[PDB]
Amino acid sequence: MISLIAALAVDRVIGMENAMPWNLPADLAWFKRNTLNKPVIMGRHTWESIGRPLPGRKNIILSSQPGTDDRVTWVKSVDEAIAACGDVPEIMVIGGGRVYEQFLPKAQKLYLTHIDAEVEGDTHFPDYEPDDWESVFSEFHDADAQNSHSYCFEILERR
Ligand SMILES: NC(=O)c1ccc[n+]([C@@H]2O[C@H](COP(=O)([O-])OP(=O)(O)OC[C@H]3O[C@@H](n4cnc5c(N)ncnc54)[C@H](OP(=O)(O)O)[C@@H]3O)[C@@H](O)[C@H]2O)c1
Ligand SMILES: Nc1nc(=O)c2nc(CNc3ccc(C(=O)N[C@@H](CCC(=O)O)C(=O)O)cc3)cnc2[nH]1
Ligand SMILES: [Mn+2]
Ligand SMILES: [Mn+2]
Ligand SMILES: [Mn+2]
Ligand SMILES: [Mn+2]
Numbered sequence: 380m381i382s383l384i385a386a387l388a389v390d391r392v393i394g395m396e397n398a399m400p401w402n403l404p405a406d407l408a409w410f411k412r413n414t415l416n417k418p419v420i421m422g423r424h425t426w427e428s429i430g431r432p433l434p435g436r437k438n439i440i441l442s443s444q445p446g447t448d449d450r451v452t453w454v455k456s457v458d459e460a461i462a463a464c465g466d467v468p469e470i471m472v473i474g475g476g477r478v479y480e481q482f483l484p485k486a487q488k489l490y491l492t493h494i495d496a497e498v499e500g501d502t503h504f505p506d507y508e509p510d511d512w513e514s515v516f517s518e519f520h521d522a523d524a525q526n527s528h529s530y531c532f533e534i535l536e537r538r
Contacts, residue, residue, distance in 0.1 A: 381461070383472045383479055384413060384490040385504050392500035394475060397428050405526045406492045413490055414471045418464040422478040426451070436471075439463050441478060457481055476502040483507060486537065493531040513538050 385393055386406050393399075418437040421429070432438045438451040439460050446453030454460045464470045472482045483505050489512065516534040520526070 380468060380488065381470050381472060381482055381486045382488040382490060383474075383482060383486050384410060385474060385479065386410075386492040386494060387504050388494050388496045388498040388500065391504040391506075392498045392502070393504050394428075394502035395498060395500040397424055399428075400498060401494060401496055401528065403492075403494060403526050403528065403530060405520065406494070406530060406532075409490075409492065409532055410473075414473070417469055417471050418467060420460045420464075420470065420472045420478065420482070422475050425473065425475040425478070428475075437464070457485075476504065480505045488537070489533075489535040491533045491535065493533065495529040511538055512536065 386399070386403070387393060388401070414433070415435050418439055419433060420439045420441065423440060423442040426438075426440045426442075432450045440446065440451050440453050441455075441457070441460055442453060443455060452463050454463050461470065469488075472478060472486070489507070512535040514533055515536050516532070518532045520530050520532075522529050
């Protein structure tokens, strides 16, 4: 099973200048809990944005060009990325925009954080047909001293 996990600001913005400008520790904790001990697939730009391997996960990087770091697994196509995960129950695709576009048709589950923040950005999460997805979990949180915006955790499953 393939799942996508992302955090979206207003208008589905996910990034600006290869960075995420907000800081929501609660959302990073949610990301870690839902990805630990699973393989994660990312594109090369997101790998450079993160800057280091994510511990406790098999890190698979999509790039057309040879890898430059043997701490992670480099693959050259979607089918190769899936094969490199092996026979696991759940594969997590962690972006960015181009990678999300390619895996969305193959995904059965979306883990979305909706952040109440207006961000000028240059990368967006793909348009997804709402009729195709059922919301199976949602949890709203007001802003607090650690998290400066309100946010909504949602899990959607393909109908
Ligand atoms: N808010 C969130 O949840 C979230 C999550 C992830 C990322 N982001 C943000 O998203 C932005 C990065 O997104 P992006 O769309 O620019 O880049 P991306 O999807 O991370 O990376 C695209 C790169 O991945 C490689 N790639 C993708 N598909 C491939 C394929 N089928 N075969 C081979 N290589 C492939 C190519 O690398 P080569 O040019 O090396 O071939 C391509 O240029 C940043 O702002 C980051 O902070 C946000
Ligand atoms: N829900 C969600 N929120 C995000 O911010 C997010 N970000 C990305 C891409 N960017 C990043 C950047 C840093 C780390 C990272 O360092 N994660 C640590 C958290 C510990 C910490 O730095 O506080 C990890 O171990 O997972 C992960 C993804 C992909 N999916 C996401 N999904
Ligand atoms: Mn092929
Ligand atoms: Mn198999
Ligand atoms: Mn949203
Ligand atoms: Mn806000």
